[PDB]
């Protein structure tokens, strides 16, 4: 039973674990479950302790201070590349990508490069130029239709009053009959 | 007179605190050719469930009945008499359904035996779902 951080005991308790807690992985969305997790207080009743070296001492352990394994992958987001190689907001960034040569038996050596995400390309600006053009036609459509309607109810302006021009004109003719 | 409750009751639409130097009662047409009674316009009562001076919309069905009890306040119970037809014995049977209707105080004088015309509206209480629209005085009873 793993130990959950911040439980303030060394025994074992059961807790409702949800989306976000440790020692639990929900299967359905919004699922909760009880799990018997162990306390955070270290004691003799454990099988394993995970330790992480903070400050390296003067001596060198042949197990951990010896074998260095480089970073598995390089940065993938475009902005993270600029922060790595101290690059400007204007210079090219595409050639500064960390590619890795892959070599194995049966295939000739290729080199794989990850696809840079959140990089400015003309496809983006062509996409950005399109929505602002859509904003243009909407404004165009609104001022056209309202003004077209504006003369159209004004087409009924002198069409609604000119009929009442005949209503009271008989109202005086109805008085003289 | 009025304002006999803990809260200050007033018609929620009209605004009675305009600077000066009587009161403009609110009343609506109810529809379906039902004439708003004179006292619903001149009287000063305040009822939120009155179909003329309150926030209820008359809709659905329009029934009729006869008053039987008035001991309840602002509410009376009418009696609907009808004949249920039974197929086997080709006859009828008197049946009755008494329902509780809200009687807005615009109808001052109405006694046991008068025929009222009620109208459906939204549920006003646990049992009340109708409102008194007009009151036809009982047969004779001119004294």
């Amino acid at each position: 039973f793993p130990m959950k951080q911040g439980v303030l005991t060394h025994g074992r308790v059961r807790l409702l674990l949800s989306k976000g807690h440790s020692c639990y992985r929900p299967r359905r969305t919004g699922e909760r479950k009880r799990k018997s997790v162990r306390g955070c207080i270290v004691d003799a009743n454990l099988s394993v302790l995970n330790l992480v070296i903070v400050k390296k001492g003067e001596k060198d352990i042949p197990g951990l201070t010896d074998t260095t394994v480089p970073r598995r992958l390089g940065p993938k987001r475009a902005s993270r590349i600029r922060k790595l190689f101290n690059l400007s907001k204007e210079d090219d960034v595409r050639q500064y990508v960390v590619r890795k040569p892959l070599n194995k038996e049966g295939k000739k050596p290729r080199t794989k490069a990850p696809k840079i995400q959140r990089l400015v390309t003309p496809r983006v600006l062509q996409h950005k130029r399109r929505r602002i053009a859509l904003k243009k036609q909407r404004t165009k459509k609104n001022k056209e239709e309202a003004a077209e309607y504006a003369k159209l109810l004004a087409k009924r302006m002198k069409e609604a009053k000119e009929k009442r021009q005949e209503q009271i004109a008989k109202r005086r003719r109805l008085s003289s009959l | 007179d009025i304002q006999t409750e803990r809260a200050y009751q007033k018609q929620p639409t009209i605004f009675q605190n305009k600077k000066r130097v009587k009161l403009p009662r609110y009343y609506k047409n109810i529809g379906l050719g039902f004439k708003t009674p004179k006292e619903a316009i001149e009287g000063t009562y305040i009822d939120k469930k009155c179909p003329f001076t309150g926030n209820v919309s008359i809709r659905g069905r329009i029934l009729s009945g006869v008053v039987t009890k008035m001991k309840m306040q602002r509410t009376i119970v009418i009696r609907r008499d009808y004949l249920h037809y039974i197929r086997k014995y080709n006859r009828f049977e008197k049946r009755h359904k008494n329902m509780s209707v809200h009687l807005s105080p615009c109808f001052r004088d109405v006694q046991i035996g008068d025929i009222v015309t009620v109208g459906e509206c939204r549920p006003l209480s646990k049992t009340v779902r109708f409102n008194v629209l007009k009151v036809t005085k009982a047969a004779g009873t001119k004294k």
């Binding site: - | 304002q3 409750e5 803990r6 809260a7 009675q16 605190n17 305009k18 646990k126």
Partner: protein, 206 residues
Amino acid sequence: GISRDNWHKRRKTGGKRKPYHKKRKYELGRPAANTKIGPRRIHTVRVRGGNKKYRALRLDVGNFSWGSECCTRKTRIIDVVYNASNNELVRTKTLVKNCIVLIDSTPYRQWYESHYALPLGRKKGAKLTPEEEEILNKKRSKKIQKKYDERKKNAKISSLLEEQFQQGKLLACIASRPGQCGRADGYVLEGKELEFYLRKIKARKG
């Protein structure tokens, strides 16, 4: 949980219903907010349809309106003085719709003295020291004076209304449901309605 259903209670005749289906989700009821006076604390809850209600738990300010003057300013609530429903909601000061509260007069006095520039409040014997409201009293142009002094035609306010401007606390009524909207809005009592609640408030003293 607590449900608000019709079938759990007796029929019109008095006969007992027998439940034919267990408690449903759409017949839900929640614990009451019981909002108090203090620093703003609002918890939003998800409701039917993926919308939100704002459970005001503690409120200090509120957008109250002055009817006759057609003015409204976001002032701070002071106390709860009267409640028609339950007498225990003024003891444990709780804001619910249709409650007589006290609000500060300053956001209104400074408006009425900027629109009419008259001695509102300010009991005689002491005068303004910073002299800013004195700037509001004088140095008007002659053209603007004649439109300003004709505001004296309606510069009067009720004796009952100005009296509470002495204390700086106005009696206001809550109009928004704070346990639902998160806001505590309302209007300022005036005329008969103000005179009515004063009769109900003094009668509580005895």
